[PDB]
Design a protein around this ligand. Structure first.
Ligand code: NA
Lengths: 159, 168
């Protein structure tokens, strides 16, 4: 039953690691999607629950699952400022240059929200500095528009 | 099920990200851009996901209530205050402080004050005295007249030493 999928989604929002493990063991769908196309992995990536992220990956969660806006878990983790989660998603084979419905990569989202350390990690993992969104804007363009000089400077120099 | 997720809001047919902890809203998302958020200033904080247009100011630790800064705030947490040396917390919450009191004459320090407790004073028992108002001084023993080959001419009190004098 997909009751268990809805329960797994709630557990992952609530940060209830023991409930996640016991729902997975009961044959919950690891890739259960809510109304907005968030998996448990997306939810844990947003809320910064690292132990939940790792246990979901170990149980076979789709690292490149898209929500209704085309955001992967890496988009979410990068946007939301969760460095350790970003590293873990990359190790597990997350697509560093995956594009959302605006054509924003994870680097775009990290640059836009001022997450310098996440910018540096994404560059090391082979993020495209020249990637343009649907309005023609690079990550550097975003960082500069948002007032994140430090990140704008790194991205100009990585180009 | 709402048109957007918990950490989003709806405007102009678009599901926009709320601003993250440590950031405030400048501009709504559009088709072409995610929500514009600006980091809180250095003496400011915001602990939750939000659409607010101002941050909270870090708490002032008022010297005139006996407070100092224990720990400067961050973009997500408030400043933490503690008592200045020589002052102790009014209550467990430590929202203001009070100067350590002195044990009056007749009373001596049993336990010295700390940042969480006032001076504990005891009445000077027999054989002991204290002639000062002080937050450090213990009860001192009465002088032994018999060590000096004198007698007690005036009795000691909680507040005064013995006055010794010659035999009759
Ligand atoms: Na005294």
């Amino acid at each position: 039953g997909s009751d268990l999928g809805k329960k797994l989604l709630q557990a992952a929002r609530a940060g209830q690691l023991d409930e996640v493990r016991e729902l997975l063991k009961a044959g919950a769908d690891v890739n259960a999607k809510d109304t907005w196309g968030f998996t448990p992995l997306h939810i844990a990536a947003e809320s910064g629950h690292l132990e939940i992220v790792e246990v979901l990956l170990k149980a076979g969660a789709d690292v490149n699952a898209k929500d209704v806006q085309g955001r992967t878990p890496l988009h979410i983790a990068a946007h939301s400022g969760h460095l350790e989660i970003v590293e873990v998603l990359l190790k597990a084979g997350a697509d560093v240059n995956a594009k959302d419905f605006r054509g924003w990569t994870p680097l775009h989202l990290a640059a836009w929200s001022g997450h310098l350390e996440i910018v540096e990690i994404l560059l090391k993992a082979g993020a495209d500095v020249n990637a343009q969104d649907k309005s023609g804007k690079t990550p550097a363009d975003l960082a500069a528009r948002a007032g994140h000089q430090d990140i704008a400077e790194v991205l100009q120099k990585a180009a | 099920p709402t048109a957007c997720r918990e950490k989003q809001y709806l405007i102009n047919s678009q599901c926009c990200s709320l601003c993250q902890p440590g950031q405030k809203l400048v501009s709504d998302c559009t088709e072409f851009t995610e929500t514009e958020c600006l980091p809180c200033g250095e003496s400011e904080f915001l602990d939750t996901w939000n659409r607010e247009t101002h941050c909270h100011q870090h708490k002032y630790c008022d010297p005139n209530l006996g407070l100092r800064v224990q720990q400067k705030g961050t973009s997500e947490t408030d400043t933490i205050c503690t008592c200045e040396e020589g002052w102790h917390c009014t209550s467990e919450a430590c929202e203001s402080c009070v100067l350590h009191r002195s044990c009056s004459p007749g009373f001596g320090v049993k336990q010295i004050a700390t940042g969480v407790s006032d001076t504990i004073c005891e009445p000077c028992p027999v054989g002991f005295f204290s002639n000062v108002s002080s937050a450090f001084e213990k009860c001192h023993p009465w002088t032994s007249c018999e060590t000096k080959d004198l007698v007690v001419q005036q009795a000691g009190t909680n507040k005064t030493d013995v006055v010794c004098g010659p035999q009759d």
